[model samples]
Target: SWQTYVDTNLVGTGAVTQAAILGLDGNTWATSAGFAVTPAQGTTLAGAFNNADAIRAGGFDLAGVHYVTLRADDRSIYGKKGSSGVITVKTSKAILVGVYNEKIQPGTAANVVEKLADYLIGQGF
Candidate 1:
């Protein structure tokens, strides 16, 4: 079954930031506890953030699917609790890829999202 996988703030430090994997279609998924990157420092981090750069490394799981739409919601500064950073999504099989701007207004969010979508689409994704 083709299901949607939505993730928000899916990458960040554990204290002031966290990611949510909002499973679509009422899929039940467990939220893993924060893992300490450095044992001595006791600082926690999300694996999602750590692995973000490698999104396309392994290729898309739905490679041969006839229709697979990957939609990313707004990546705004206001959406974040503190300072914002770059947000990106990519797939090796030329699926959808995006880079969103932080701290954009609601109206502008759509534009940025579309622009990113266009750019990614133009990139052969």
Candidate 2:
């Protein structure tokens, strides 16, 4: 199930504090407990794939906190707020997200999210 992907393949990595899966249309598939990605946030994320520059300049908010976008592109978007950050990757049919706090390096968390996204895309998710 998709929840398994969030529980085991994502947060289980220890690098991610929260994880979520969303459809291309910004519909939630599954999200780790206490970490809800609202439809508006999801849609903004979907839109970011095409407007990386804007995100880089204005940043974005999630879960009521703002993050300064560090990287944005068709395949991935990364943002940071202090020592915490978010990493997201776009697959053909879904978006994969992982969150990391001060205890984890942003690069490490990003690696985990990106690798999982690659695996899911390879599996035709």
Candidate 3:
């Protein structure tokens, strides 16, 4: 039954190959996280809302899976923390926001923000 799915490669990987990969489109997924103010992780990033569903779905639905990694290169200044330099995640109906001071050093904010932007751009965003 699972054979009905098609394989696809990550956008910026080598050889332009496609395999039965598991993950949401990073852009859409991140946008959802940004809008929803939900730091998506694990099964949530893969579209499973609960642990049972995740397990029952066969844990990424791949056999002989060796390794998997998820990386978020957030460049948007809105997610950072500060009284004056803070990032906010909001929806039209409500605002669910946070500060990033703890995550970034005070002086390094600008550099980190710029680097993250550069990384996102390099990723073809």
Candidate 4:
């Protein structure tokens, strides 16, 4: 029943995902999205999710080095983050598909987040 519930929920949203991680103290939180992940990678992600505050509070410099997307194979939209205390989408339209980039520079390149958001809203939130 749980499987059907989850599956149907996703199906209705028209978003497909392999995995997503999240963390929060309140409504404010951090998130991550990726597919085909390994346990070690997942563990490390939890750490980043927990440390979002450290990065934001100290204004720490962070970098993200990869990009994942549902839009296109070569296009990227994922980015670096510091969880308020931990960490954590799916979609279609291929070139605008969901993705995770574990690393990225904070400017210009970071605009991918905006681009991703724009595409998502245009499609209907």
- Choose the strongest candidate by TM-score: 2
Q: Cα lDDT of all candidates, in order? A: 0.25, 0.89, 0.25, 0.28
RMSD of each: 16.3, 1.0, 15.4, 12.3
Write the residue-wise lDDT of candidate 4 on 8-125 in tens digits.
3322233323213222111212222222333344333333344444323332211222322112112232333331110122223212212222232333233433454355547653
Over the stretch 1-125, how does candidate 2's per-residue lDDT look in tens digits? 99999999999889999999999888789999999888998888988887776688999877777899988989999889999999999999999989899999888998899998889889998
lDDT of 3 by residue, 29-62 (tens): 2221112222232223333321234333333221
- State the lDDT of candidate 1 residue by residue for 104-124, as single tens digits: 333443343334435644655
TM-score of each model, in listed order: 0.23, 0.95, 0.25, 0.29
Please give the lDDT score at residue 43 for candidate 4.
37
Candidates 2 and 3: which is better by TM-score? Answer: 2
Ranking by lDDT: 2, 4, 3, 1
Compared with the true structure, model 3 gives a TM-score of 0.25
TM-score of 2: 0.95
Error of 1 at 12 (Å): 14
Which regions of candidate 2 deviate over 4 angstroms?
none
Better of 1 and 2 by TM-score: 2
